Design a protein around this ligand. Sequence first.
Ligand SMILES: *c1ccc([N+](=O)[O-])cc1C(=O)Nc1ccccc1
Ligand SMILES: *c1ccc([N+](=O)[O-])cc1C(=O)Nc1ccccc1
Ligand SMILES: *c1ccc([N+](=O)[O-])cc1C(=O)Nc1ccccc1
Ligand SMILES: CC(C)(Oc1ccc([C@@H]2CC2(Cl)Cl)cc1)C(=O)O
Length: 270
Amino acid sequence: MTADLKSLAKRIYEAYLKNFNMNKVKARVILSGKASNNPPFVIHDMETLCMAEKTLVAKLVANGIQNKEAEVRIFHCCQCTSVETVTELTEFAKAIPGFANLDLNDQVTLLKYGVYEAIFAMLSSVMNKDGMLVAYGNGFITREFLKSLRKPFCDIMEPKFDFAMKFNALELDDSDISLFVAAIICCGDRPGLLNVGHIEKMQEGIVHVLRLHLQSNHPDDIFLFPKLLQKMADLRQLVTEHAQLVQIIKKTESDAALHPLLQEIYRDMY
Ligand SMILES: *c1ccc([N+](=O)[O-])cc1C(=O)Nc1ccccc1
Ligand SMILES: *c1ccc([N+](=O)[O-])cc1C(=O)Nc1ccccc1
Ligand SMILES: *c1ccc([N+](=O)[O-])cc1C(=O)Nc1ccccc1
Ligand SMILES: CC(C)(Oc1ccc([C@@H]2CC2(Cl)Cl)cc1)C(=O)O
């Protein structure tokens, strides 16, 4: 249990709560509705989509996407939410003791492979069996409407709902997700890592606080730590399959222009 570790556990917790505006507590209260009778605007078909797109009429006109196919509009603003999460993650990583001290090539490498493995883990916080919160909790896209899209777009988010359902069953709080996300970033297994030895030292410190933190917060889930280690493996597989589907859609779809920042991350990944 010790004391210095508890401080580190909360440095990682105070960060995250500061960099990620949408956490599990806020999301879990919206989906519960036990704090407001003003539910979010549900998006379950093309009509509700075009309605919700009436608000964001400026972002679409200036971006030249107003008259694009429905699938290209969704996975284009949704692509904009990941560019924001990558920025927040880059700042959250600074709170990880030892990360700012590593070589820039290693920092860029760790974030290059860990951003999406964490985007999908945190994405589960705003997901249930029927949909996921969007627009900072103001909207709610249905899990079925995303499947109703034409392939391959309909095969993009369904795997995320699959992981989220099994992941959310572990019943973690932001205190646990923070350390978990920190462990994802500190992974000495990423390809091309220079000082592969030091990063392993930094990962052991985080993974150790995570094991002790889970043992202290979820005392009855003896094997919660092994379960999370398995989830880290599934996230790596989930990102691999996802990144492969972006390259496929990047050439076979002449109307879906990938974002520049995300274009560098997906380059020569898996
Ligand atoms: C993304 C796609 C479509 C819309 N829309 O039809 O309004 C909105 C968004 C979105 O993420 N908006 C947003 C902006 C700023 C902060 C939170 C959410
Ligand atoms: C980001 C947020 C919202 C929208 N939108 O719905 O108009 C678009 C974006 C965005 O980043 N679009 C984009 C795509 C490709 C290259 C640059 C910018
Ligand atoms: C896509 C990925 C992540 C989020 N998010 O968690 O804020 C949202 C979206 C998204 O596509 N939102 C959306 C779609 C359509 C209309 C409004 C908002
Ligand atoms: C997690 C998420 C939403 O996955 C995507 C989805 C769509 C795209 C864009 C449209 C093509 Cl396929 Cl060029 C890139 C990444 C993201 O990275 O923002």
